[PDB]
Design an enzyme around this catalytic site. Sequence first.
Site, mmCIF file in Angstrom:
data_model
loop_
_atom_site.group_PDB
_atom_site.id
_atom_site.type_symbol
_atom_site.label_atom_id
_atom_site.label_comp_id
_atom_site.label_asym_id
_atom_site.label_seq_id
_atom_site.Cartn_x
_atom_site.Cartn_y
_atom_site.Cartn_z
ATOM 1 N N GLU A 1 0.745 -0.940 0.039
ATOM 2 C CA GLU A 1 0.066 0.031 -0.024
ATOM 3 C C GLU A 1 0.899 1.329 -0.028
ATOM 4 O O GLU A 1 0.453 2.224 -0.623
ATOM 5 C CB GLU A 1 -1.000 -0.027 1.203
ATOM 6 C CG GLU A 1 -1.646 -1.337 1.502
ATOM 7 C CD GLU A 1 -2.950 -1.358 0.490
ATOM 8 O OE1 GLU A 1 -3.613 -2.337 0.312
ATOM 9 O OE2 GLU A 1 -3.027 -0.499 -0.407
ATOM 10 N N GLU B 1 -4.379 5.226 -0.991
ATOM 11 C CA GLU B 1 -3.278 4.305 -0.588
ATOM 12 C C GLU B 1 -2.619 4.634 0.798
ATOM 13 O O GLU B 1 -2.063 3.801 1.579
ATOM 14 C CB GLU B 1 -2.276 4.255 -1.838
ATOM 15 C CG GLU B 1 -2.811 3.839 -3.119
ATOM 16 C CD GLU B 1 -3.295 2.417 -3.315
ATOM 17 O OE1 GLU B 1 -3.256 1.721 -2.435
ATOM 18 O OE2 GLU B 1 -3.504 2.146 -4.407
ATOM 19 N N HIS C 1 -5.045 3.075 3.047
ATOM 20 C CA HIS C 1 -4.733 1.694 3.147
ATOM 21 C C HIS C 1 -3.511 1.287 3.886
ATOM 22 O O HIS C 1 -3.343 0.477 4.682
ATOM 23 C CB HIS C 1 -4.458 1.019 1.774
ATOM 24 C CG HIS C 1 -5.887 1.361 0.993
ATOM 25 N ND1 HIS C 1 -5.864 1.030 -0.495
ATOM 26 C CD2 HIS C 1 -7.031 1.622 1.276
ATOM 27 C CE1 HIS C 1 -6.869 1.540 -0.805
ATOM 28 N NE2 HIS C 1 -7.751 1.850 -0.063
ATOM 29 N N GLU D 1 -3.668 -4.052 -9.303
ATOM 30 C CA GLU D 1 -5.085 -3.824 -8.823
ATOM 31 C C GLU D 1 -6.177 -4.810 -9.089
ATOM 32 O O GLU D 1 -7.041 -5.337 -8.575
ATOM 33 C CB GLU D 1 -5.183 -2.399 -8.746
ATOM 34 C CG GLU D 1 -4.240 -1.642 -8.054
ATOM 35 C CD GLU D 1 -4.335 -0.047 -8.309
ATOM 36 O OE1 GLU D 1 -4.854 0.250 -9.449
ATOM 37 O OE2 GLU D 1 -4.197 0.673 -7.441
ATOM 38 N N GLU E 1 -10.756 0.285 -4.536
ATOM 39 C CA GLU E 1 -9.970 -0.399 -5.802
ATOM 40 C C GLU E 1 -10.877 0.018 -6.850
ATOM 41 O O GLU E 1 -10.042 0.119 -8.228
ATOM 42 C CB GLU E 1 -9.638 -1.593 -5.530
ATOM 43 C CG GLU E 1 -8.339 -2.102 -5.921
ATOM 44 C CD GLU E 1 -7.007 -1.367 -5.380
ATOM 45 O OE1 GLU E 1 -6.688 -1.594 -4.173
ATOM 46 O OE2 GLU E 1 -6.517 -0.655 -6.025
ATOM 47 N N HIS F 1 -9.231 2.852 -8.628
ATOM 48 C CA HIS F 1 -8.047 2.625 -9.015
ATOM 49 C C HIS F 1 -7.952 1.864 -10.369
ATOM 50 O O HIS F 1 -7.255 2.286 -11.283
ATOM 51 C CB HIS F 1 -7.311 1.915 -7.835
ATOM 52 C CG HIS F 1 -7.216 2.583 -6.653
ATOM 53 N ND1 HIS F 1 -6.363 2.293 -5.623
ATOM 54 C CD2 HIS F 1 -7.899 3.511 -6.274
ATOM 55 C CE1 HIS F 1 -6.591 2.905 -4.535
ATOM 56 N NE2 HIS F 1 -7.338 3.884 -4.945
HETATM 57 FE FE LIG Z 1 -4.982 0.733 -5.330
HETATM 58 FE FE LIG Z 2 -4.369 -0.085 -1.829
#
Ligand SMILES: [Fe+3]
Ligand SMILES: [Fe+3]
EC number: 1.14.13.25
Lengths: 392, 392, 515, 74, 132, 132, 168
Positions: free
Chosen positions: C103, C133, C136, C198, C232, C235
């Site tokens: 992360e 991130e 995370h 991802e 995500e 992402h």
């Molecule tokens: Fe990500």
């Molecule tokens: Fe992440």
Amino acid sequence: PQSSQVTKRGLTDPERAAIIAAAVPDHALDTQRKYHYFIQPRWKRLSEYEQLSCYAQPNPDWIAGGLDWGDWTQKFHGGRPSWGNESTELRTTDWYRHRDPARRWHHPYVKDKSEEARYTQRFLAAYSSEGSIRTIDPYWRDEILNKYFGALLYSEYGLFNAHSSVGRDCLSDTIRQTAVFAALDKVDNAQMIQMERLFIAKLVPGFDASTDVPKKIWTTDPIYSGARATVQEIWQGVQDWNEILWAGHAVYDATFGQFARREFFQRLATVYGDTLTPFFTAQSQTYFQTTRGAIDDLFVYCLANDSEFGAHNRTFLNAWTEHYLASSVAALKDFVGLYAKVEKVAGATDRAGVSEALQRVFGDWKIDYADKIGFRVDVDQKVDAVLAGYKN
Amino acid sequence: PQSSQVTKRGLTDPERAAIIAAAVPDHALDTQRKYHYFIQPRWKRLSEYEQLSCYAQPNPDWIAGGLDWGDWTQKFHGGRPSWGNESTELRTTDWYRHRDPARRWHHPYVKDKSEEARYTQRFLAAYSSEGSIRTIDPYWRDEILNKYFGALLYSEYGLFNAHSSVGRDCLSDTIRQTAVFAALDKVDNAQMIQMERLFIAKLVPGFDASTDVPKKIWTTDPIYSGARATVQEIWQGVQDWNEILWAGHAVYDATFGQFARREFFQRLATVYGDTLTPFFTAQSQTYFQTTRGAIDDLFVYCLANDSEFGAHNRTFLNAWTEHYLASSVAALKDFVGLYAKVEKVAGATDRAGVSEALQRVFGDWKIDYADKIGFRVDVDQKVDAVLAGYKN
Amino acid sequence: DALKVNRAPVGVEPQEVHKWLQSFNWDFKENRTKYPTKYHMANETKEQFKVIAKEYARMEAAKDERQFGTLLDGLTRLGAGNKVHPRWGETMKVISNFLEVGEYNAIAASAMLWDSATAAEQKNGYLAQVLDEIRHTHQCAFINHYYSKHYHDPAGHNDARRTRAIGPLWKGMKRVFADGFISGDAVECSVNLQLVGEACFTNPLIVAVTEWASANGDEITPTVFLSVETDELRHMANGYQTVVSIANDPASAKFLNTDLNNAFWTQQKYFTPVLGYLFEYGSKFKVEPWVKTWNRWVYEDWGGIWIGRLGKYGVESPASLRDAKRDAYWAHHDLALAAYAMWPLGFARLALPDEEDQAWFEANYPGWADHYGKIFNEWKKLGYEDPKSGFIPYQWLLANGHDVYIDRVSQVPFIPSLAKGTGSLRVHEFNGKKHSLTDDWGERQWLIEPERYECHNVFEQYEGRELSEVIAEGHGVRSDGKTLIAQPHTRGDNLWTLEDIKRAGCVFPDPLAKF
Amino acid sequence: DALKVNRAPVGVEPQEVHKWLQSFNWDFKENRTKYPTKYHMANETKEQFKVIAKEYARMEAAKDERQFGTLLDG
Amino acid sequence: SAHNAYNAGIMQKTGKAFADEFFAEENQVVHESNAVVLVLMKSDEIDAIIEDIVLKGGKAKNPSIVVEDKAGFWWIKADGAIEIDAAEAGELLGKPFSVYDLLINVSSTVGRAYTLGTKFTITSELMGLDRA
Amino acid sequence: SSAHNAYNAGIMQKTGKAFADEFFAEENQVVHESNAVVLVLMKSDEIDAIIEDIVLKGGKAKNPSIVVEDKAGFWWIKADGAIEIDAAEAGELLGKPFSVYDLLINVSSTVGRAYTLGTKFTITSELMGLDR
Amino acid sequence: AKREPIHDNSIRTEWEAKIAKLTSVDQATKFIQDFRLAYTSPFRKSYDIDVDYQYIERKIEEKLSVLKTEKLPVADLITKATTGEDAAAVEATWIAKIKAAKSKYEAERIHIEFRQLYKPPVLPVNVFLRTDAALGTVLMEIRNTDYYGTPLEGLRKERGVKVLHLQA
Ligand SMILES: [Fe+3]
Ligand SMILES: [Fe+3]
Ligand code: NA
């Protein structure tokens, strides 16, 4: 160890969880999972606000809309019922009809005010670090803002306590929530006014944040003479809980309150270089419009247009409006004497500027309240009545 | 049914919970329950902010402060390390030393901005209902606010994107968090300026909230010529991530940025009857002071006073300051030409008013930054340099 | 005018501001990325999830309040923090902290995508990803933070950011979802981080693992990990927009298939054996065979819904997939041999598979009993768990010619005489230095790009040193200063100390000295 | 003045506002309860838990978030 | 549609039978799939959406939808696309529920996902590559 | 220690006829003045840390009569005279902002006179305004 | 061989003693360039300090950087390499050098040697990062041309490795 047993949890203890699993049926015993499905939804579908609020008050069938039956278990000495129709002149086919358009039960209410509470303190720590107080007009800060905006907290405080009897006497759950939330917002306004004054005291040496001068002005200065007389009557002179709510929010605060907060202190802050006060009036004006939405629903949607008692209720609302509007223009006529003490700014503090401010307040009020209950009002007449107290 | 097994939960399923309970020892296997107890605490006790942030970056011992060892597993073509000392001229005994005084990890950061996000929308719905926009000076609203405050969003946007390379290149976790949170606050500023313009468009017919005119002013109007040249250089002209953070926040935004946001648009809003803009500048100025505390800790507490490299770092910081202050003074010299287009207000927009505004900005900057890195600066000289661009 | 205005209540929704974001950029000669890249195609795209700063914070703060309510109130009142099977509580020391560095490196990689983006909307979306991130990173830290406070063994939960540096499995973690993201082409991150990392591997690593946690009594990790993955969606969507622009330009598209294959192999080389080992050997209750998890998420769904669908537009199935599928079946069993044999170098307490586990392994991987099973049972009979035995299996491997090698590229351990997964040892001397490579794909990477791969391995750093001294120096002990964090069993008694390790006399050799 | 000011970061704590609450009342003849009661003694007391509107909301919302997180999520 | 089940096809086999198909020559390259995978983490709002939207009007429109219980989340797979209208969920939940609020518990997606108005959609279509 | 402050102290130890005999004894038909206080803390991450590292350490060191019992969802505390909790000490323990207002988030019940003085919360047997 | 402790050993201590005796920018620049040519990259002259060279390089950088701020005028820190060369001329020289390379093997050595010679503090950081990125672009592009075209057996010969072992 400990003297009492350490209770085994049925959710996680293997032995008790197995016993519970054997006792729970392998299917649901009904399919109706909508909490209080029988509430008549105001909108397209039942809201969580209605599910949690509606019919919490245990009214019997002899209080319009109640679902229960029989007399109360214990009444006042003499026979006054726990709740009763004798508590107000207004009548309806169902006291439960009211719906706050903001749909505030307790959680969304404190959730929003919590946001304002924490952001305010971050704003003050940054404002003090910015030093932006340096460019405020000192005369406005010391002679007008500190003294007369401080005095205005007593108006907000009196309107707050006007709700004490309302919180006891009113006849339904949604109304009680509206009344109590409106009361907290008023005492919040008075506390926020004092917070700004205490805050300025930390930035300006010699600035006295004590309430001694504001209280003396509120209680003896003729500028607030009419306002204080009106607040004392709405708060302590009446117990009809509908009269209090209407006179308080729909007449007095909608006219004098809006002029003082919005037309005077908030507006003139932005002509005298006051970068601090607009942050505080932003909250009181937000609270006013939120309260207005609920007050509008109670008196216009529900009471002034009740299928059986609409015209009946407008009769009382008309009489209350006539009395408390006269009180409010007398308050405004006294209050506009404060313009004689401010530095003149063309279009804001001259006669034309004050006239246009009164036209906004009285004009908006005619649209927002008077037109909706059938109360005839000549806007120019009320403006000229107040302007008689303005020194040219 | 379903094709895959319905997994039984070890927490509640009796059979699996009994197996787990038999395997779990009846005592703790260590008493050290402080997550990353070995972090050197900046304050009297280790904070959760430090526990969650510090040493998340896996630096080796050849990057000052790293606890790991050996080379990186995969480097750039040519040999550039994943992180490396070549990323900045500045040196320290430990890149992990930096501490945000607000102690922001991700959760408190989004928690605070969430409050501002939701309260903003409640404020706008009430402001539109209040009609308070009616008393704003239309020339200020249309010719100064809409066009030149709109143009200012491009300065905030460029400062936002200046952080892109910093977020990749910087050498520690607390620094990376400081930079990224500062970047979001900048792009927030640019979005909030546009939000106010879009909001005014809903209230004033004919008011154009398109960015066509603001973008044309930012890219071609000489009033923003110096500012845009400085932003382009800080954003895209350098990759030394310490230079970017210092030039961006400690020099340019602390001088030109503070004058434009606070001394011009926020201050003059409170002389032209603008009751709306102070709500938006309240946020950017709160964000500035929060960002300044973290920027101040990185460059003053950590780098300018690092036991081994303090004077070494001040040499570079002094050279950067001399260059970017000249850029910022030239930007302000261009910017004060905007006063030739505003309505004259004594003490605010006349020469004496602009002089005192420059004395506040340059004076505050000398105390907040210049004195702390040993950068000598003559405030009156810098004020007089900018005033050379003021039209009498 | 001063009297008349529309007083209807209005605000400004996020999409109203977002539609003007693309105009926030302006043209100047230096307005381009700072990082080296092979991709210079037009990439002015629109982001599928319109978000602004204020709405980003509102969304994430709402996720957080529900998550921290569950953790700090409900689950704490239930005492759930110590209701986890010891095998899985130890596994979460490794899973949560190793993911944390992934992360954290994703922040820097997302900043490169931010920097290399050319559309303002794309720069806006990658900043939100950069912020995610960070979120995370702190979420993974919070799991180990919570375990430190409520779980029966806080050691290793409470200091992995330094104790991970002792062992060899951490070296490969610094590439798989770390160096492999941020040390290369900046816009190529849309391929390795996003299209591969991802869109493919986060699902088994972050989502599927939550069912294994629940099976073994862990409800903390599902509370957090399932919230992690909600970010995500944006992402994956950011990366797909760039992959489209790459596929549309013929000059850019000619780099895509090679970058995809290198990314898939780089990530699967470590992810497949390590996660499979942690799932199957670091649990008591198994959800399903790891190779079925891999088949469902990696081969069939990702390979079919992303790669197979993109095949209509020139994207090729990764040439390394065949080697990867063999790794999916056996490589985590190979890794278990190295993990159990070198247990004192970690920061988690391990459990040899019991009789019920062994039957499950052999049923789902026929051949496991006669190979891995016989080895684990022989180690147990030798005293694998007994601190007074003086037995550590790494010396046992050497005494029987089962040398352990470290891939110069991926850092993944390799035992050629025992491995059933993909691999064959290649030992090259270059400029007076010996290098060991283990597969066709990594050897090409090292042969073409030797200056990218100079990672020191544990044998080079620890050469000739005794095991207990390396552990003590690296702080691999509990608060008593003597008992190891790592253990070869999960019981509360008979814990190994530095003196117990020292009696075995294990000294690190040079595995390439014989070549 | 216009140039010099203390720029130390300060806010206003709830107890700072609360100490002035007692002065928010004013005297007038009708300022008394509306309900029947037998108790008419002097009762000007101070509340032991200083709270204002903003701090009340912050406290209760904090309780709510943990409660509804446990219910609707966990 | 059993071909969208979590344990469909090779996932039914165990032991040597599984390995034989897993290592079969035709299975050493990816196979294009028209499916989408949606993961929803369990919660009060999501479980109501699963029962009264996805498994009712959702599966009525797309009979290929398969929903499986994975302890902490919902596993959903379907041909073509899966859609969830936040406005419909908001009417179900009785509280404010924008498309942004819907994403609070939308955990994973295998496919092309986007929001269009109040609707969230994950689709097999390759936007920007496939014909509009 | 002090067994007289235990939840099951005195008559609560008895069952059956023995309990009834004392419960209905003549001397137990009027209340008896008690110098004790009862504090209830609902279980949470912050509270469980406060119980272990404040109440059961420095708390009981000052007041050895403190008895703490586990009641599944909350803590049961009883002591002679008074019980105090300094929010500043808890804030040092938790490593996060923790005013006396935040301390009250999980303080569920009080039997006695409770108040806050600065950063300290206190429940006391004293009858403030009456005693002394 | 027996390695000493990781972070504190005689090799690092002995090299710190050598670094402390550097007293001029010229001496430290020659010191750091000779060090990077001898001990860094796959084309280093010696691996005798392999597990210590990165830390030692850090200490040499710190010495040269402090000497720069003590002895050099501000303008030299921005526009000149410590070799005396104009920083912009160094950038243009090495960008042109790698763009004229006829193969990835020529291009890789130009990039590697540029870093060995001009890694900061020798070149100003801003100029170095610009040049490094420009060089890496060319190196990446020529390396990713027919990445799988040459079999491993050919790649081993092109690299010039001595093949010590190939498992059957
Ligand atoms: Fe990500
Ligand atoms: Fe992440
Ligand atoms: Na009385």
